[PDB]
């Protein structure tokens, strides 16, 4: 049906509008799955492995690994989210949603005969302007305990139950403030994370030492 | 060798106990949940794939249930009660299913709480009797002479279908067809719309052009083009016997020895046809309609007398024409009488719609049969419009026979539930708990209406229940479009008493039937 | 050659072109002539041919021997055809026509 | 799922899945049929399972001949089939408008909107659009020029330019020939006859009939100048008795007598025909043609040919009415009382032989109320394509004559309708304004597809046309040669008013019904 | 990340076995390639030096021929663009009878040059418009290239010379003899009335004596034997009957009802006497030959033998009608004796032994008649089939000459002159259509190129010489196949001419087929079916 | 008109043997039913009797 199929009969090819359709459909599927994760009002997902292990999570990256998906565009987006998680540790669901919406909005004009190159140029200009706006809009503050507690809350509340998040806020803030040295990079390897399975979930705490 | 020996045959299974009851109740609940979302004026439509390749895009519950195949016998019973409700009254099919599912769901509790099913059944039957009494109490009379009231009733019947856009035209068509069909002979009143109220679907045109004719329309054309396709005041003559020359029943054979006998026999065949045509002509008709073939020579003799002939109409179509134009179908033209001649049709026109010829016998005076010409986007749209028209005509007939009305939108359900609870407050035996359970299970209709409207069920239903506890609030229901509690004396949503009675009876009796059942045995050959 | 998703001729069509197919035709004609080569002259010999049903035919006639052979080669069937033509028109010389034609071709 | 729980081998799509499936199917159909719209469209080539070649451009033919097994595709195909059956045009526009309506509705549904509000907006927009279409139609006296323009605007979109130019004259002349004043036009009175021996531009109109069968007796004359036509429906072959007669004789002489006496019935009718012919025309100058709907045995053929009579047997059933209207006789079912006044007249009858097939031409009629169109081409697919094109043209001309009005084409009407809908949108209460906007955007698909087929871009051409319409107020369309705004009224690009009304009604109804479908089942097994 | 899913939309909705091709690369170029392949397959059999091809059809029936139409018919062509080109070739064969290979070669050349134009940047519509303009220009130029006219069709020598060119392309070695045969056969037919019927020429193939022994007979030959004892007459008085030579019976039902012994004893004698009386009545008119289209009764045969009457049984009704035409009789539907006007006459009817087959010959002596037959001798059935195809080509050429008597030079002279004139016209046309016009002109080079390739010489030298000579001003100079080196000669002097109608219709049909193939942009092929053919095709 | 295709997006990208239950009725009610079944199996062993 195409040039490649003549040389290799057992070849799968998607060309021209088919390529865009396939990629945008995969991105929209991923976005539709991950919409419900965003925000503290998100919905927990049950993930069951082949061996029968039960994992309850709402993390975007953890969900992306555990989705039973075998799509190329999904693989690319999963790699991008994995890099996000590895470097910053947050925003994977935001990556998936923003990528899906970007592709959808681009297709909204591409279906009208517009070439994708113009859309990409507009994307680059908009990204430059948005970066400038982000630089001017940021709030530079002295990182006292209250601000760190607020950030930890804004993360954990969107990750776990409200009361458990409240406990974990003091836990994580105190740990970071304990291991932090003045004007030096923070070594997260120096915070041991040990699991015990004999008490309630609100019994988790921080120990000034090692276990 | 030594094949196994056992009492019952192989492939003969048997289960018993709480498992059977739970399975039956779950099957009924699944049947209810299939069409739970197709109730109310804001119901969504469903697309069903016919195994013969067809598509049924419909909102009616009965069609949806009859187009699906189930293996669990309880689901079969639910489908059967849906069909029974559709046949008996015409509408209410997706309400009785929901009611039966809810009643079985609330009976499962008492079954699991060590209560024998017979006690539950007795309580159910007492509750059904009290529901019937309450519905008969809260009904209101309706005078069938008021056309506006009948149109309003039909509208309230069709606001939940896809035809609500043209509701006014649909109501007028249904009312006119029902009035035309209504007949009385020998003191036996009759409203038979399944035979003399025909719906014809011609794809194309616009839905606004659909109308009910003062006559009968058939997909037939003149046998010979020389016949008139437009007659002002035709005199109809109907036949159900061939106008040809045919063999007799007895085995007969000729034996020709003289030279001129062959031609004599052929000439006598021609003369027999001529004699039949002359017998027909002696009544001086304008058209002749037959259910059997008409020979070309007979066509020539009919055209010689300036008579239009329609060759092969169906039995039902001929009966409809006889009812409309006042004719009387006869078999032997030798016995034709002036009384059998059909006078009363005001126009016979054979026009072309699309690429096909159609015969109109419209403009009749006092016709007792009619055809509803439906024009629309495609075949499925017209099928759904026909189903809605059937629902409307059934509702109109029910109101004509049974002239009482009850409030709609769940107002009747809540009123009956409140009355049942008040009566249950007086009982002291163990039967009171299933009684009250049925009373509150009757509240599923307003709850489903609120759920389909998109409003919140809890507070709206609580407010409605509190409202129904007052002295005069029997006509307070819900809006299926705005999600607010309104008095149905103002909204105007009313339903025939017969429909509600049939719905409650069928739901309660289906619950009774499925409660009695245990020890399912399957697999045995006939 | 390439797969050409939509092919011109029906699949399974065999085509042979050029000098090699002409040489093959000549060789087939030689083979046909060899089958009746020894039935010529007063010192000729008979050939026994058994059909599918088991009935045998013993003949010195060249046309008969060629007809009993189920020749399917398109070029070789011309020798059988000319032998039958010689039998029809003359009745003698059915062995000589095949030898002469094959020898011309060789 | 509940259905899968009850029936394990059942397929179910529910909630957003049903909408996604339906919209995907509609978008696929629309994407396939985009290239059909307009005269600048691309011919599609269809090969059946038996290898038959079908060259076509119609939306309905393409829909029928695509190998598609989708439910939504089936629904849209039925809608287009009704469109073709009633009006004969607008199937491609039907599919395009349905798909664009669904896409525009999804554009809002995907943002949490409910389909019911979109359907309400669609209904309001459809009502306003019908009002505007009634306002904008051009009531004109349908002379020959306007009919030629309409036939051109159909045929050029269907077939090649020169072929369309020929077919315009053919179709318009045929329709004007069969048309009676203040009487509905019967399209059965136009024969569409195929011949396969000349070029496609040799298609013409014959003021008479062409029959696919000729005389079966070699001795009959192949050309009659002045002919009297006897259209009859009487069997002239041997017919057995209905009552199982059989013959009984005691010698060969009696057998001969019975053989001679068993032909007398047919011989009487043959003698009646011969006597009528002798009485009517006593010289050899005038001719006599007998066209019979039933068979004629060789004995009767010889008897007739011995009297200089051309006899045709097994004629088509509709040919009786065609010959009665064209030649002007009376179709006879029996020869009981036949008079010279029931004979038709034809100014020329001759036989044309093409390969193994024979044709008969009946021309030079006095005032033929029924005519024939002779489709000529070198290939079978060419003949089929020309037949489809002439069907479309005949339907277009008949619609133009019936509805005394006509609507400007070239995309102007829907551009104006969309602009009017946008102006009327504030008058709509609630969030149905979103549905109104979606309806207007969907209506704007036709100029977009025309621009693509002409090789231009949507945005620039559309904004140019809309700006011109807003500034001037005229009905400006798409100029497929330059892309500039152009008023279709002067150039003669016309569209059928009935076609536009049917398009609006059917598209709105089917889109509303599809949008409200929330659950698809296949559980009848 | 191991599979590429089908794109949403039409790709997923397509049926299991269906195929969809869209755009230029997937559809137009593939169709052009298929048409080129078909043209390449048929190319080698063009011209006098073309080589025969052995073709085995699906039924193992062997065809050896250089006729393009037959080769295409017996080939199982499956690509539908090639199918369209084949239909164009068959339409050319039906309309004219010769030039099918010209149609195929011209279509292939046009499609290749169109592919080149599409690659260099031109759009499909521009190429189609240029092709149509160039075709109109070629049709305008063609009448000016007519070098001579037939000017006489009642002559034997001149008609033979006219048909020699037509039947030299096939059976190149010996075309003078076939020219004489076909000329005599066609001159016997074609009376003073201008209308000429191809069907009136009959071909009888009898194996045994080589094609040089063929001859023409002013009559009809039937490969059968007489029913009765009489095997030869001298003053035949044929009476043709369309009914069986037996006492006719009732069509309803026959039942001999016997009620007495006398009737039982007399029935057979009465029937025999009736048959004898009928046969004697037929014979008394002077008829010594009786031809019947049905079964022959034994008593009727005996009584025909008794009165010295020749009986011939013709099964086919076409044969009976042709005999009636060639003799001058009318097939009587009953067994009545023929009246004077309906009794046919032939100068001699006899039974003959030609080679092996037994034949019955209805032979005239005067050099006229309605139907004339050609007996073909040979050593192989396939050889006689090829000779029959050549005879059909010659007869079709004669029919065309009766239609239009104008002729154009052959051997590529007309093609080269047309190419030169079309190129000159296109050089003066501004716009993008000049490329299409020039390519249409260059497509005419495929004919002289094919002729030069088949003759075994270098095509480039031949074409360069043809351009040089045509530029000098000689419009009647074409390829000289009787040379071992590229050489040219005047073909009007050589007598090599082509029918004007043949060239006109071939150019028109080839251009139409090429344009129609180019118009296709999308292909939707259904899943192939194993059904037992459509009922209409049988 | 004889088969219901899988909805574009996540439904098509799902693996061969995987299952996806979403929403109230498909997931929460089924989980509650399974837990009720387990409790029913274990119930009859409660207490001294
Ligand atoms: N405008 C309305 N507002 C509120 N409830 C309505 C309205 N119209 C109808 N209903 C209720 O909806 C029910 C009819 O729903 P329908 O889909 O027809 O179910 P069924 O087919 O079982 O009759 C009636 O019981 C009526 O009380
Ligand atoms: N010469 C022209 N110039 C501009 N627009 C045209 C011209 N001819 C037709 N059109 C437009 O192109 C459209 C052709 O649609 P068509 O292919 O006929 O679809 P359908 O067959 O479904 O009606 C018409 O709506 C008409 O308005
Ligand atoms: N003696 C000859 N010398 C040169 N060219 C010839 C001669 N005879 C025929 N031709 C050429 O051969 C061509 C005929 O090819 P042919 O095999 O008949 O194909 P087709 O049957 O399609 O016409 C003619 O165009 C003619 O110009
Ligand atoms: Mg986060
Ligand atoms: Mg209802
Ligand atoms: Mg010998
Ligand atoms: Mg159109
Ligand atoms: Mg030739």
Residue F29 annotated in ligand binding: no
Q: Are E397 and E166 in contact (CB under 8 A)?
A: yes
Return the partners of chain F (3 or more C-beta pairs < 8 Å): A, B, D, E
Kindly compute the dihedral angle of the four CA atoms of residues D215, D218, D224, D229, in this order, to the nearest 10 degrees. -30
3-class DSSP assignment, residue D377:
coil
Say if the Cβ atoms of F9 and A74 lie within 8 Å: no
3-class DSSP assignment, residue D510:
helix
B60 is a catalytic site residue: yes
For residue A183, is it left (φ>0), alpha (ψ between -120 and 50) or beta?
Answer: left
The residues facing E21 across adjacent strands are E523
Say if the Cβ atoms of D43 and E520 lie within 8 Å: yes
Per-residue buried b or exposed e for B38-56, using 16+ beta carbons within 10 Å of the residue's own CB: bbbbbbbbbbbbeeeebbb
Closest alpha carbon to D376 in D200, D167, D122, D214: D200
DSSP letter for each residue of E95-106: HTSS-HHHHHHH
Maximum alpha-carbon separation in chain F: 62
Q: Are E381 and E478 in contact (CB under 8 A)?
A: no
- Tell me how far the alpha carbon of residue E502 lies from the centroid of ligand 8, in angstroms: 9
By Cβ distance, the residue of F1, F3, F25 closest to B55 is F1
Structure tokens at E386: 């090829």
Experimental technique of record: cryo-EM
DSSP letter for each residue of chain C: ----SS-SBPTT-----SHHHHHHHHHHHHHHHHTTGGG-STT---EEEE-TTS-EEEE--HHHHHHHS----TTTHHHHHHHHHHHHHTSS-HHHHHHHHHHHH-
Residue F46 annotated in ligand binding: yes
- Report the residue of chain E nearest A21, measured CA to CA: E7
- Report the residue of chain C nearest E72, measured CA to CA: C9
Closest alpha carbon to A101 in A34, A38, A36, A31: A31
D91 is a catalytic site residue: yes
Backbone angles phi, psi at D134, to 5 degrees: -60, -35
Structure tokens at C1: 């050659």
Round the CA-based radius of gyration of chain C to a whole number and report it.
18
Other C-beta atoms lying within 10 Å of the C-beta of residue E153: 18
Closest alpha carbon to D82 in E436, B356, E233: B356
Kindly compute the dihedral angle of the four CA atoms of residues D77, D81, D83, D89, in this order, to the nearest 10 degrees. 100
Backbone angles phi, psi at B218, to 5 degrees: -130, 155
Sequence-distant (≥ 6) Cβ neighbours of residue E178 within 8 angstroms: E167, E171, E387, E390, E391, E394
Residue A180 annotated in ligand binding: no
Which sign, positive or negative, has the C-alpha torsion D189, D194, D197, D202?
positive
Q: Which residues in chain D have Cβ-Cβ distances shorter than 8 Å to F26?
A: 1
For residue E240, the surrounding DSSP H or E stretch is: strand E239-241
Residue B345 CB burial class (10 angstroms; 0-12, 13-18, ≥19):
buried
Say if the Cβ atoms of E252 and B257 lie within 8 Å: no
Structure tokens at C8: 């011109």
Q: Are B488 and B476 in contact (CB under 8 A)?
A: yes
D283 is a catalytic site residue: no
Say if the Cβ atoms of E8 and A25 lie within 8 Å: yes
Instruction: Determine contact: E256 vs chain B, CB below 8 A.
Output: no
The residues facing B189 across adjacent strands are B184
Atom 16, ligand 3: which residue's CA is nearest?
E47
Q: Which residues in chain F have Cβ-Cβ distances shorter than 8 Å to D20?
A: 7-9
The best mutation among D157, D485, D499 to test binding of ligand 2, ranked by most ligand atoms within 8 Å of the C-beta, falls on: D157
Between CA D208 and CA D190 the distance in angstroms is 10
DSSP E212: G
Backbone angles phi, psi at E415, to 5 degrees: -65, -45
CA distances from B181 to B175, B192, B373 (A): 10, 7, 16
Q: Which residues in chain D have Cβ-Cβ distances shorter than 8 Å to E242?
A: 298
- Tell me how far the alpha carbon of residue C34 lies from the centroid of ligand 6, in angstroms: 17
Indicate which of D62, D65, D160, D251 best probes the interface with E, i.e. most E CBs within 10 Å of its own CB: D251
Closest alpha carbon to D62 in D93, D27, D24, D33: D33
Instruction: Determine contact: C86 vs chain E, CB below 8 A.
Output: yes
CA distances from B353 to B27, D178, D186, D496, E205 (A): 48, 18, 11, 18, 61
Give the active site residue among B391, B475, B503, B506.
B391
Between CA B106 and CA B102 the distance in angstroms is 6
Between CA B97 and CA B31 the distance in angstroms is 7
- Tell me how far the alpha carbon of residue C86 lies from the centroid of ligand 6, in angstroms: 11
Between CA E127 and CA E515 the distance in angstroms is 9
Structure tokens at B326: 């006042």
Residue A91 annotated in ligand binding: yes
End-to-end CA distance of chain A: 64
Q: Which residues line ligand 1 (CB under 6 A)?
A: B 39-41, 43, 61, 91-95, 156, 159-160, 408-409, 449, 478-481, 493, 495
Q: Are A96 and A76 in contact (CB under 8 A)?
A: no
The residues facing B200 across adjacent strands are B373
- Tell me how far the alpha carbon of residue D38 lies from the centroid of ligand 2, in angstroms: 4
For residue B358, the surrounding DSSP H or E stretch is: strand B356-360
Indicate which of D16, D459, D483 best probes the interface with A, i.e. most A CBs within 10 Å of its own CB: D459
Q: What angle do CA B196, B200, B204 make, to 5 degrees?
A: 165
Closest alpha carbon to E411 in E350, E491, E509, E484: E491
Distance from the D339 Cα atom to the nearest Cα atom in chain F, whole angstroms:
59
Measured in whole angstroms, the distance separating CA B402 from the mean position of its chain's CA atoms is: 17
Do D and F count as touching (3 or more CB pairs closer than 8 A)? yes
Closest alpha carbon to E134 in E421, E367, E457: E421
SS3 per-residue string spanning chain A:
CCHHHHHCCCCCCCCCHHHHHHHHHHHHHHHHHHHHHCCCCCCCEEEECCCCCEEEECCHHHHHHHCCECCHHHHHHHHHHHHHHHHCCCCHHHHHHHHHHHHHHHHHHHCCCCCHHHHHHHHHHHHHHHHHHHHHHCCCCCCCHHHHHHHHHHHHHHHCCHHHHHHHHHHHHHHHHHHCCCCCCCCHHHCCCCCCCCCCHHHCCCCCCCC
Indicate which of C8, C14, C101 best probes the interface with E, i.e. most E CBs within 10 Å of its own CB: C8
Instruction: Determine contact: A42 vs chain F, CB below 8 A.
Output: no
Sequence-distant (≥ 6) Cβ neighbours of residue D102 within 8 angstroms: D22, D23, D26, D27, D511, D514, D515
Instruction: Determine contact: C4 vs chain E, CB below 8 A.
Output: yes
Do the strands E19-22 and E520-525 form a parallel or antiparallel pair, or are they unpaired? antiparallel
Other C-beta atoms lying within 10 Å of the C-beta of residue E313: 19
- Ion ligand 6: residue ranges with CB closer than 5 A: C 92
The residues facing B237 across adjacent strands are B288
CA distances from D87 to B203, D80, D185, D402, D449 (A): 11, 10, 14, 11, 22
For residue A88, the ligand closest to its alpha carbon is 4
Per-residue buried b or exposed e for B171-193, using 16+ beta carbons within 10 Å of the residue's own CB: bbbbbbbbbbbbeeeeeeeebeb
Q: Are B447 and B457 in contact (CB under 8 A)?
A: yes
Listed by number, the residues of chain E in 13-42 with a beta carbon closer than 8 Å to a beta carbon of chain C are: 19, 21, 30, 33-34, 37-38
Distance from the B257 Cα atom to the nearest Cα atom in chain D, whole angstroms:
5
Closest alpha carbon to D321 in D303, D344, D354: D344
Structure tokens at D172: 């318009």
- Named by the residue before each, gaps in chain B exceeding 2.5 A from C to N are none
Say if the Cβ atoms of D78 and B37 lie within 8 Å: no
Say if the Cβ atoms of E252 and D246 lie within 8 Å: yes
Tell me the helix, strand and coil percentages in chain B, rounded to 5: 50, 15, 35
Closest alpha carbon to E312 in E425, E393, E228: E228
Query: Which residues of C are part of a known binding site for ATP?
Result: 41, 93, 96
DSSP letter for each residue of D133-184: HHHH-EE----HHHHHHHHHHHHHHHS-HHHHHHHHHHHHHHHHHH--TTS-
For residue F10, the surrounding DSSP H or E stretch is: helix F10-13
Closest alpha carbon to D334 in D198, D230, D477: D230
The residues facing E291 across adjacent strands are E240, E312
CA distances from D394 to D144, D204, D407 (A): 14, 14, 17
Closest alpha carbon to B501 in B129, B160, B39, B153: B129
Distance from the C100 Cα atom to the nearest Cα atom in chain E, whole angstroms:
14
Other C-beta atoms lying within 10 Å of the C-beta of residue D260: 13
Say if the Cβ atoms of C8 and E82 lie within 8 Å: yes
Other C-beta atoms lying within 10 Å of the C-beta of residue E202: 18
CA distances from E265 to D258, D426, E258 (A): 21, 111, 10
- Report the residue of chain E nearest A17, measured CA to CA: E7
Say if the Cβ atoms of F4 and D522 lie within 8 Å: yes
Instruction: Determine contact: A48 vs chain E, CB below 8 A.
Output: no
D485 lines ligand 2 (CB under 6 A): no
The length of chain C in residues reads: 106
The residues facing B406 across adjacent strands are B495
Q: Are B98 and B440 in contact (CB under 8 A)?
A: no
CA distances from D204 to A120, D365, D377, E385 (A): 56, 16, 12, 40
SS3 per-residue string spanning B186-238:
CCEEECCHHHHEEEEEEECCCHHHCEECCCCEECCCECCCCCCCEECCCCEEE
Say if the Cβ atoms of D524 and B351 lie within 8 Å: no
- Tell me how far the alpha carbon of residue D173 lies from the centroid of ligand 7, in angstroms: 20
How many Cα atoms sit within 13 Å of B342 on the Cβ side?
Answer: 32
The length of chain F in residues reads: 49
Which sign, positive or negative, has the C-alpha torsion B39, B40, B43, B45?
positive
Atom 12, ligand 3: which residue's CA is nearest?
E47
Backbone angles phi, psi at B60, to 5 degrees: -65, 135
Instruction: Determine contact: E212 vs chain B, CB below 8 A.
Output: no
DSSP D453: H
Backbone angles phi, psi at E526, to 5 degrees: -70, 165
DSSP B44: P
Q: Are B163 and B170 in contact (CB under 8 A)?
A: yes
Say if the Cβ atoms of D85 and B162 lie within 8 Å: no
B58 is a catalytic site residue: no
DSSP E58: T
Distance from the E528 Cα atom to the nearest Cα atom in chain F, whole angstroms:
21
DSSP H helices, E428-499, are 433-443, 446-455, 459-472, 491-494
The residues facing E220 across adjacent strands are E362
For residue B94, the ligand closest to its alpha carbon is 1
């Amino acid at each position: 049906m195409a040039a490649v199929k003549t040389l290799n009969p057992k070849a799968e090819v998607a060309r021209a509008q088919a390529a865009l359709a396939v990629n945008i459909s995969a991105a929209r599927g991923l976005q539709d799955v991950l919409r419900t994760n965003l925000g503290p009002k998100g919905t927990m997902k049950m993930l069951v492995s082949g061996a029968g292990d039960i994992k309850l999570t709402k993390d975007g990256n953890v969900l992306l690994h555990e989705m039973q998906i075998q799509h190329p565009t999904a693989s690319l987006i999963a790699k991008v989210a994995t890099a996000q998680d590895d470097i910053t540790g947050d925003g994977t669901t935001s990556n998936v949603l923003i990528i899906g919406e970007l592709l959808k909005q681009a297709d909204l004009y591409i279906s009208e005969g517009l070439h994708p190159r113009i859309i990409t140029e507009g994307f680059e200009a908009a990204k430059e302007k948005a970066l400038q706006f982000l630089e001017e809009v940021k709030v530079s503050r002295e990182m006292d305990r209250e601000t760190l507690i607020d950030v930890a809350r804004t993360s954990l509340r969107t990750k776990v139950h409200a009361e458990l998040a409240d406990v974990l806020t003091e836990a994580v803030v105190d740990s970071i403030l304990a291991i932090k040295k003045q004007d030096e990079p923070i070594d997260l390897f120096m915070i041991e994370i040990m699991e015990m399975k004999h008490k309630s979930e609100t019994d988790t705490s921080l120990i000034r030492g090692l276990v | 060798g030594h094949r196994p020996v056992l009492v019952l045959s192989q492939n003969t299974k048997r289960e018993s106990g709480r498992k059977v009851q739970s399975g039956n109740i779950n099957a009924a609940k699944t049947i209810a949940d299939i069409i739970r979302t197709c109730l109310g004026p804001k119901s969504m439509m469903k697309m069903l794939l016919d195994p013969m390749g067809g598509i049924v895009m419909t909102n009616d519950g009965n069609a949806i249930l009859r187009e699906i195949q189930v293996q669990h016998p309880a689901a079969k019973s639910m489908i059967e009660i849906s069909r029974t409700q559709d046949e008996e009254v015409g509408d209410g099919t997706t309400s009785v299913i929901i009611l039966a599912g809810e009643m079985l769901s609330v009976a499962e509790h008492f079954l699991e709480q060590q209560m024998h099913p017979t006690v539950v059944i007795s309580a159910y039957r007492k509750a059904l009797d009290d529901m019937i009494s309450t519905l008969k109490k809260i009904s209101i009379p309706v005078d069938i002479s008021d056309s506006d009231m009948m149109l309003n009733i039909i509208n309230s019947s069709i606001t939940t279908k896809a035809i609500s856009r043209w509701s006014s035209l649909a109501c007028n068509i249904a009312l006119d067809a029902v009035k035309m069909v209504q007949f009385e002979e020998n003191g036996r009143k009759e409203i038979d719309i399944k035979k003399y109220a025909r719906v014809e679907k011609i794809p194309g045109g616009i839905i606004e052009d659909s109308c009910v004719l003062r006559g009968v329309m058939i997909n037939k054309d003149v046998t010979h083009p020389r016949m008139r396709r437009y007659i002002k005041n035709p005199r109809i003559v109907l036949l159900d016997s061939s106008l040809e020359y045919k063999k007799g029943e007895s085995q007969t054979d000729i034996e020709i020895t003289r030279e001129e006998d062959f031609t004599r026999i052929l000439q006598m065949e021609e003369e027999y046809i001529q004699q039949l045509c002359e017998d027909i002509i002696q009544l001086k008709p304008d058209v002749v309609i037959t259910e059997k073939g008409i020979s070309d020579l007979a066509q020539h003799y009919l055209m010689r007398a300036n008579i239009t002939a329609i060759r092969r109409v169906r039995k039902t179509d001929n009966n409809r024409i006889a009812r409309a134009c006042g004719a009387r179908i006869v078999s032997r033209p030798e016995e034709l009488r002036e009384d059998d001649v059909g006078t009363g049709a005001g126009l016979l026109e054979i026009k072309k719609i699309g690429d096909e010829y159609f015969t109109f016998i419209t403009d009749c005076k006092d016709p007792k049969a009619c055809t509803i010409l439906l024009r629309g986007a495609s075949k499925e749209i017209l099928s759904e419009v026909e189903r809605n028209l059937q629902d409307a005509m059934q509702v109109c007939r029910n109101v004509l026979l049974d002239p009482q009305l009850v409030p709609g939108g769940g107002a009747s359900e809540m009123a009956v539930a409140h009355a049942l609870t008040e009566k249950s407050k007086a009982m002291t035996g163990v039967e009171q708990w299933p009684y009250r359970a049925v009373a509150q299970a009757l509240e599923v209709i307003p709850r489903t209406l609120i759920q389909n409207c998109g409003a919140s069920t809890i507070r709206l239903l609580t407010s409605l229940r509190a409202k129904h506890t007052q002295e005069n609030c029997e006509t307070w229901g819900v809006n299926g479009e705005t999600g607010t509690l309104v008095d149905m004396k103002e909204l105007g949503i009313w339903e025939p008493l017969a429909v509600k009675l049939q719905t409650y009876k069928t739901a309660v009796e289906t619950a009774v039937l499925l409660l009695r059942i245990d020890d399912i045995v399957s697999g045995h050959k006939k | 050659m390439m797969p050409t998703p939509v092919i011109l001729l029906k699949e399974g069509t065999d085509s042979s072109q050029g000098i090699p197919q002409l040489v093959s035709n000549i060789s087939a004609c030689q083979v046909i002539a060899e089958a009746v080569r020894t039935t010529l002259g007063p010192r000729g010999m008979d050939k026994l041919i058994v059909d599918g049903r088991g009935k045998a035919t013993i003949s010195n006639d060249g046309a008969t021997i060629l007809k009993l052979l189920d020749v399917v080669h398109p070029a070789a069937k011309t020798l059988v055809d000319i032998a039958k033509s010689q039998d029809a028109e003359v009745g003698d010389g059915t062995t000589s026509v095949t030898l002469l034609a094959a020898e011309f071709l060789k | 799922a509940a259905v899968k729980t009850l029936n394990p081998k059942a397929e179910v799509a529910r909630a957003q899945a049903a909408l996604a499936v339906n919209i995907s199917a509609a978008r696929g159909l629309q994407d396939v049929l985009r290239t059909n719209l307009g005269p600048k469209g691309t011919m599609k080539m269809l090969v059946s399972g038996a290898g038959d070649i079908k060259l076509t451009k119609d939306g309905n033919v393409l829909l029928h001949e695509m190998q598609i097994q989708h439910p939504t595709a089936s629904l849209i195909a039925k809608v287009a089939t009704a469109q073709d059956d009633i009006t004969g045009d607008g199937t491609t526009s039907n599919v395009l408008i349905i798909g664009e309506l669904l896409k525009q509705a999804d554009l809002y549904i995907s943002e949490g909107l409910h389909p019911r509000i979109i359907t309400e907006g669609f209904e309001a927009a459809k009502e306003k659009a019908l009002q505007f279409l009634e306002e904008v139609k051009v009531s004109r006296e349908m002379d020959r020029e306007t009919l030629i323009d309409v036939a051109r605007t159909s045929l050029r979109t269907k077939v090649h330019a020169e072929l369309a130019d020929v077919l315009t004259e053919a179709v318009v002349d045929s329709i004007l020939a069969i048309k009676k004043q203040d009487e509905p036009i019967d399209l059965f009175m136009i024969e569409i006859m195929e011949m396969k021996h000349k070029s496609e531009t040799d298609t013409s109109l014959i003021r008479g009939l062409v029959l696919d069968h000729g005389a079966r007796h070699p001795d009959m004359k192949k050309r009659v100048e002045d002919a009297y036509i006897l259209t009859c429906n009487v069997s002239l072959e041997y017919e057995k008795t209905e009552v199982n007669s059989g013959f009984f004789y005691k010698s060969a002489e009696e057998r001969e007598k019975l053989v001679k006496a068993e032909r007398k019935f047919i011989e009487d009718r043959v003698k009646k025909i011969i006597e009528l012919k002798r009485k009517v025309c006593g010289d050899s100058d005038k001719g006599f043609v007998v066209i019979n709907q039933k068979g004629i045995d060789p004995f009767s053929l010889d008897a007739l040919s011995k009297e200089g009579i051309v006899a045709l047997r097994r004629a088509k059933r509709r040919n009786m009415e065609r010959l009665t209207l064209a030649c002007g006789g009376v179709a006879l079912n029996s020869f009981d009382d036949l008079s010279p006044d029931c004979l038709g007249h034809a100014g020329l009858v001759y036989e044309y032989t093409l390969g193994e097939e024979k044709f008969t031409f009946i021309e030079k009629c006095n005032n033929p109320r029924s005519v024939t169109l002779l489709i000529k081409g070198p290939n079978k697919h060419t003949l089929t394509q020309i037949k489809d094109a002439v069907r479309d043209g005949l339907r277009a001309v008949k619609n133009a004559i019936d509805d005394g009005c006509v609507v400007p084409g070239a995309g102007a009407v829907e551009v104006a309708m969309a602009e009017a809908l946008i102006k009327h949108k504030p008058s709509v209460k609630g969030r149905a304004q979103l549905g109104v906007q979606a309806f207007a955007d969907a209506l704007l698909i036709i100029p977009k597809v025309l621009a693509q087929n002409s090789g231009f871009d949507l945005q620039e051409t559309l904004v140019k046309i809309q700006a011109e319409h807003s500034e001037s107020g005229q009905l400006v369309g798409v100029d497929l040669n330059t892309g500039e705004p152009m008023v279709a009224a002067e150039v003669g690009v016309w569209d059928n008013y009935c076609v536009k009304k049917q398009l609006l009604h059917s598209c709105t109804v089917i889109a509303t019904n599809i949008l409200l479908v929330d659950e698809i089942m296949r559980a009848g097994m | 990340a191991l599979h590429v899913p089908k794109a949403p939309g039409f790709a997923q909705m397509l049926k299991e076995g269906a195929k969809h091709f869209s755009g230029l690369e997937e559809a137009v170029y593939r169709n052009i390639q298929a048409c080129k392949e078909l043209a390449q397959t048929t190319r080698t059999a063009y011209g006098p030096n073309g080589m025969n091809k052995m073709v085995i059809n699906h039924l193992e029936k062997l065809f050896v021929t250089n006729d393009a139409a037959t080769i295409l018919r017996e080939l199982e062509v499956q690509h539908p663009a090639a199918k369209m080109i084949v239909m164009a070739s068959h339409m050319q064969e039906q309309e004219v009878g010769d030039g099918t290979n010209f149609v195929l070669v011209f279509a292939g050349a046009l499609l290749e040059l169109a592919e080149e134009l599409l690659r260099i940047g031109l759009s499909v519509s521009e190429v189609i418009e240029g092709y149509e303009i160039a075709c109109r220009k070629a049709h305008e130029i063609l009448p000016n290239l007519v070098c001579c006219s037939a000017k006489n069709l009642r002559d034997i020598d001149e008609v033979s010379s006219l048909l020699r060119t037509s039947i030299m392309s096939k059976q190149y070695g010996n075309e003078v003899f076939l020219a004489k045969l076909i000329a005599q056969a066609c001159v016997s037919i074609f009376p003073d009335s201008g209308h000429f019927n191809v069907d009136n020429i009959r071909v009888c193939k009898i194996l045994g004596s080589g094609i040089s022994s063929s001859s023409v007979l002013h009559g009809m030959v039937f490969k059968k034997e007489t029913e009765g004892d009489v095997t030869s007459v001298k003053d035949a008085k044929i009476a043709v009957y369309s009914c069986p030579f037996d006492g006719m019976i009732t069509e309803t039902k026959g039942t001999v009802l016997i009620k007495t012994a006398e009737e039982l004893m007399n029935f057979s004698k009465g029937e025999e006497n009736l048959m004898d009386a009928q046969v004697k009545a037929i014979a008394d008119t002077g008829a010594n030959v009786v031809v019947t289209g049905g079964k022959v009764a034994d008593m009727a045969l005996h009584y025909a033998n008794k009165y010295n009457i020749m009986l011939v049984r013709l099964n086919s009704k076409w044969d009976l009608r042709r005999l009636c035409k060639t003799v001058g009789a009318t097939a009587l539907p009953r067994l009545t004796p023929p009246v004077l006007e309906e009794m046919g006459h032939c100068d001699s009817v006899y039974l003959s032994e030609v080679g092996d087959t037994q034949v019955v010959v209805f032979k005239h002596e005067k050099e006229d008649g309605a139907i004339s037959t050609i007996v073909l001798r040979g050593s192989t059935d396939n050889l006689m089939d090829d000779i029959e195809r050549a005879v059909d080509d010659g007869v079709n050429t004669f029919k065309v000459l009766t239609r239009d008597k104008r002729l154009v030079p052959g051997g590529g002279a007309t093609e080269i002159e047309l190419a030169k004139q079309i190129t000159s016209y296109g050089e003066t046309c501004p716009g993008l259509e000049q490329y299409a016009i020039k390519k249409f002109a260059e497509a005419f080079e495929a004919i002289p190129r094919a002729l030069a390739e088949n003759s075994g010489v270098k095509a480039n030298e031949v074409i360069s010489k043809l351009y040089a000579v045509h530029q000098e001003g000689n419009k009647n100079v074409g390829l000289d196949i009787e040379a071992e080196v590229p050489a040219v000669k005047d073909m009007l002097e050589a007598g090599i001419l082509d029918t004007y109608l043949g060239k006109y219709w071939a150019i028109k049909l080839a251009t139409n087929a090429a344009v129609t193939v180019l118009r296709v942009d999308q292909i939707i092929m259904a899943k192939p079916a194993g059904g037992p053919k459509p009922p209409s095709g049988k």
